[PDB]
Symmetry: D2
């Protein structure tokens, strides 16, 4: 009542969002377990969290868990297409500041982040940051250093954001410590891999309703996202080829039953059209970029792709695909929101029955969130249980209140302890109805662990 401190597409979607949040709570036992465990302790009482992450139903359950543990938040999405408008509405209607809708312009995206940072035109009294991709983190360091003086930490969701943090640390420009949430095993080897397994073919089906069985796919990259993406397509019956620059990841692709190829002859990308394996790309029906790198589906690749191939990206940022080239040279025909036919016949107009087009999904933005709903609740449970534990840890450490000599000793980018990683995993397993076996004292002694764990040395790769 009287609450106007938000901006969403349609507040009347709130009841629908609330119904979906109630379903999602039953799919997120690790997060709901954190709510029950810590609600009395209120470990986030006094925390004021700036949050920048895809404003989905799953993020709604994360926000309400932080709030239930005592935090106040101000929220935005980290992508212009990833918000679920009913989730945003349900959060705003609960009295929580959120600035997010599906289909933002770049200008609106920046404005939404700014509305979390500023309250009534002045810097909010923020003391914690939760980020996915590093955009909020970057704006705070470049534009609001006085705010970082009073911030105790950053908890960063995703591979790309972690890389940006490590670059700041290397350069001496990171102002507050961070937890790399991505590299919990219950994040990286759950969300990044199995989440894309679930949601990649999901988004492609919703966008195009194409049969995938029997068609040819090229997955660029075979890290955690590339592994999950390749499985998402292979399990549908696609004939999947994999490209990689890392020979260890390429080895895994071979042993997993994929043919490893390069878009470039002998894998040498010298910028000429002559370097493109036109015979290979002329047979590809679907290309997916998974790298976190720049220009891995480039202009000459796009020119050589089979007519009517689908082009999409599931890495964090759209510059994996040279969409700028396509905006400059080719005519875009909107099929429906986040689905565009790109006519390679020219820039000025198109024939409605032209056969020489590509289908681009989500304008090159994260395709699982742009054309579907991203990862499912029961996977995001893992990632967001880690986020909550990381917020608790850094808020309780109170870095901003430390003397300068003590700050220097704690300015780092760290992961959560393996014991907590395991405790999140156990809640996930119980959610499936799995029954973990308890070591006898002799067995725990034999392999050199405590019965309650941790069960593996920190070097273990799973």
């Amino acid at each position: 009542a009287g609450f106007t401190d938000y901006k969403v597409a349609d507040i009347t979607l709130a009841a629908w969002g609330r119904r979906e949040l109630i379903i999602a709570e039953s799919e997120m036992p690790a997060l709901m377990g954190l709510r029950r465990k810590y609600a009395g302790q209120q470990p986030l009482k006094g925390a004021k969290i700036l949050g920048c992450i895809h404003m989905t139903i799953q993020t709604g359950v994360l926000i309400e868990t932080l709030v239930a543990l005592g935090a106040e938040v101000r929220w935005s999405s980290c992508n212009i297409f990833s918000t679920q408008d009913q989730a945003a509405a349900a959060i705003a209607a609960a009295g929580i500041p959120v600035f997010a809708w599906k289909g933002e312009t770049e200008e609106e995206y920046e404005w939404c982040i700014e509305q979390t940072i500023l309250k009534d035109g002045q810097p909010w009294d923020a003391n914690m940051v939760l980020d996915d991709g590093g955009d909020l983190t970057e704006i705070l360091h470049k534009k609001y250093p006085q705010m970082l003086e009073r911030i105790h930490g950053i908890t960063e969701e995703t591979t790309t954001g972690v890389h940006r943090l490590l670059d700041m640390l290397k350069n001496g420009t990171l102002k507050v410590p961070a937890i790399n949430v991505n590299d919990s095993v219950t994040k990286s080897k759950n969300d990044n891999k199995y989440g894309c397994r679930h949601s990649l073919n999901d988004a492609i089906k919703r966008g195009t309703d194409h049969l995938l069985s029997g068609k040819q796919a090229l997955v660029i990259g075979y890290g955690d996202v590339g592994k999950g993406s390749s499985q998402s397509l292979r399990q549908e019956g696609m004939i999947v080829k994999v490209a990689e620059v890392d020979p260890i990841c390429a080895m895994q692709a071979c042993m997993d039953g994929f043919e490893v190829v390069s878009p470039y002859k002998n894998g040498i990308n010298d910028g000429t059209e002559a370097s493109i394996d036109a015979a290979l790309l002329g047979k590809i029906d679907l290309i997916v970029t998974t790298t976190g790198n720049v220009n891995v589906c480039d202009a000459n690749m796009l020119k050589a792709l089979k007519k009517r191939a689908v082009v999409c990206n599931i890495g964090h940022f759209d510059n994996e695909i040279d969409t700028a080239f396509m905006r400059k040279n080719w005519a875009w025909e909107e099929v429906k929101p986040q689905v565009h036919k790109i006519h390679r016949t020219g820039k000025d107009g198109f024939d409605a029955h032209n056969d020489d087009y590509l289908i681009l999904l989500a304008e090159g933005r994260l395709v699982n969130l742009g054309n579907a709903t991203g990862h499912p609740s029961r996977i995001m449970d893992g990632s967001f249980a880690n986020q909550v534990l990381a917020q608790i840890h850094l808020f309780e450490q109170k870095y901003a209140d430390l003397p300068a000599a003590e700050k220097a000793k704690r300015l780092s980018v760290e992961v959560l302890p393996k014991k907590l990683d395991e405790e999140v995993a156990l809640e996930m397993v119980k959610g499936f109805g799995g029954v973990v076996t308890q070591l006898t004292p002799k067995q725990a002694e034999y392999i050199g662990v405590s019965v309650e764990g941790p069960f593996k040395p920190d070097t273990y790769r799973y």
Copy 2:
């Protein structure tokens, strides 16, 4: 070849020409190992090395042995398991003039005697200066029984998870006398050999031992580490309905996401020692149990008593004590079907009825089943592991730990892994052997993600 060569003990020297035929085939399947031969033969980096080697005497180990020799080493060899030798591999190596003491079907006494025949030459300690081990038995015998020989040894290169665990325990207790390289934890070993090797060779061994249809039947895999992951896939890809047990909730999470039901042999996961804690309804439905843990007594006597009639029991971890075979020897009658395949009649100890329906089928007497009942991992997978072995041997031999003063020795007494750059170079040769084409980063791309164009491509923290 050498005139009058008698410094070996194998089952049947007439298998040597067959073994050599298979070695020549394997060379074509092991491009990383054969690349090291081509790259380093001229340099002879192992000239002067005298390697004690203890690892399964397979055709794949033959190619490893002849790679070490080609690079300048002398070796004396034994198997690290009583059932894992391929007799034609041992024969071909002996016929090449290489001391080898190994045959399929050793007794435990013969197994120990074979290791001692590598340690000893003409009744006295060989002047060994390198060790290559798989599981730590030779490492243990040297420390326990021949500690003075370790004064001349520059390093141990240890193949497998269990062996590394034993080394780390020695290091922490102050009992390890020479530095070691953990070959297991190269990604081109652990995430190639331990996983994909078992995927290939578990169902292979079960088929050769039993010729049982696997499709449609119920399996329980104990463990979901690298071997458990590969083993579960070996069975699921055949159409088994696979359930997975784990103590590690992270590994259990992966099993659930990989499409397996995660269960415990014990009610609520709690073993209280009693038969009442066994989930007898679960175990009464299981057609196949596979242990993969590297732990002790994970398929215990009460589980064995509860298993479905005519279930197959096997172990693919390094040591046989994963299964309580001792209980079965004490209480139940063993009927050999053929070598390494026994029906174990639960009707009693003394005799058995030839037509009794209440038996279990034990493979390889509970020893590593892929090597006991088939041929272990294929050459193209062992290529990764054994390329790492050669590089580790070169590294420790060139470091010359035994020649350092006692102060410098304390600084280098460690258990280390190979650097990621080398791991990557092994993988690249493996990928090329499949005909795969790795893409080269542009300078701008390499700058963008913060790597060199030549690698390494991942931080040391990366888990693949």
Copy 3:
């Protein structure tokens, strides 16, 4: 042009964009347009059509029209229409009566609107049907219209069954072609189509993770085979129920555990007969049988809390949804997704944990909660439909003498050569290359180089 009724005519441009995409996905059907356009084999045909008004059906409709036909069209399910497809067809001046979310009364009205033109029966002479509802209405309510109709081409397993029952009973009035049992229909559409579209519909309705959860698929015919694969490939632990031991054998060999909801498989009506331990572990039940009450009231009571319940057979009586309407409280999550609260009939607690999630109110879930089968699969089914329409229309049964009619009153399938010719176009659509026998090789196996390559008994 006002001779239509759709949800929103302004969706026409969107539907037309998707029809142009779908044409590129349907080489067999577009090949028929190109090859028969000159002949106009359906010139003079007036086709009553009743099948899911999807984008794929739009390409079928426009193929029939391109070959000379006139049509009047309705959907064969209340939830399966894609409104943009219906709009695009209406905007092309083709009469269609169909929208997503019809009531049962509106569904019947829509069929009647195809049957009647300007308050009088249309001079129809052909029928295209999916499930047999239009066939049934013509026989029961408008039998004199059947005196001018040359044949029926029936799409699906349930409709074929209904045709054979009338043939057996002497009540079928016109000849029919069983389109379902072309191999490029039954062993393409019924199986692979459900493989594509079942997990699709479950994700769109619930966004549930499927990996690691327990499913029970009731049935293992073609739909059950495809459905089981749809779930297993996502990582579900899939159990299968069957009454047919041969289909059950296939499930075992395919790597599924075969179970019954009933102790020892005996469904004697009592709660005591339910395997409550089994059902208490199931996260998802999918019915695929074309039978009645295979997910019954006692099974629904025993199911794990928050399990998903859906049906991908033709009719919603596979699940006892009437029991649930009578006894439990329905909370709509969003269209075609309902939480059914087992706490009672009148009202519910918004935070109650004891509910089931029913998709599409028990109607065909792939069409109700997603878009049904993809264009490239429907290409096979609808190429057969066009060929079957050409064949019956040219036979001109309604014009034959009575004794000539008695000899042609049957339910037939298309010849194998045509089945193979559809398959060849589908294979070419994937870039596949079929090998041609040498004369010696064809002699050796006793076939012609042209084919057909298999005897009519071959099961593929």
Copy 4:
């Protein structure tokens, strides 16, 4: 003093018996018939000439026929498919069997002749069980007087049925036959899932090659090609499929395989120029599954990637042009049923030559040649059908009918669906599966009897 047999080594009998006793526990449909019909002795007076792979599984079939009252004289239908411990155990039981692994072609013919002749004269045979048609052909060509007294042939496999149908077409078939192959519990169990189990099995035993990540080309996508393709894909091979039948090719595409032809545009015109050399030069493994002739021809063999494996899982070895390889290339035996074929010439080879192919089982049925064929629990279905087929034709007593009645009965038929379903039910119970029973209302609703059959005869499963 039983001497009416010839096997490799009779001392293998005890080992064979141990394996028969295990296989009995894996064959519930077949052992179910043994228990059901033992008292009635429905094959009393039957005298069966059998020609089928002398495996442990065939051992259980033979002893089921004998337990039901039959006498038999047995041979293998392939020179490499016998399991010598199975043959020894059968001989040691007093059953005439002439079979060993590694027969020459002359010995193969001699073995069949030893079943046909007893003490130098025609045996008083009155039934035939065959797998591939060689025994059936010899009887028709050489022993027509014996066929006058034979009541029927029960034929196991696709190729043998084709041969029967050709004879029926030509009016040369002299006795009726049951096509056992086309029971669903045979064709869609044995032909498909049996090859799924045993193809990668045989390749591993012959070569120990890693299959994951390598390229395979499967020629054919019928029942054997479907199972074979799955055998390789499930191991992680990248599997391409060739077909002449566009419906089978459509299935391969929808099952997630790339469909390719060895020949450019699929046109096999006999020229080297017609070979897709780029494709063949990428293939690590080629498997023929067709029942056809020369589907892996000389020009394909010349074009294959160095060190590719070549094998055949169709009934006969002429699927591959091995004659060409014998005539032009040097053969190096690696071990029994594994040969390197050196494409450098005919007159000897270099032991370190890199340009060779690996041929398994000299192109004969590779699952049986290099491993043990299908597993017992799959063969259970096929051989339950064989037993039922033998009972049916023996009880019809065709040989004793008047000429006019023979004419009405001379046919090639399948077993009725009710039997096919009952076999399937015993197989499902063997897995612990529980089939649901229709209610009366449900049976009425779909128009079937509660006991079945549940499908019309047109149903394809």
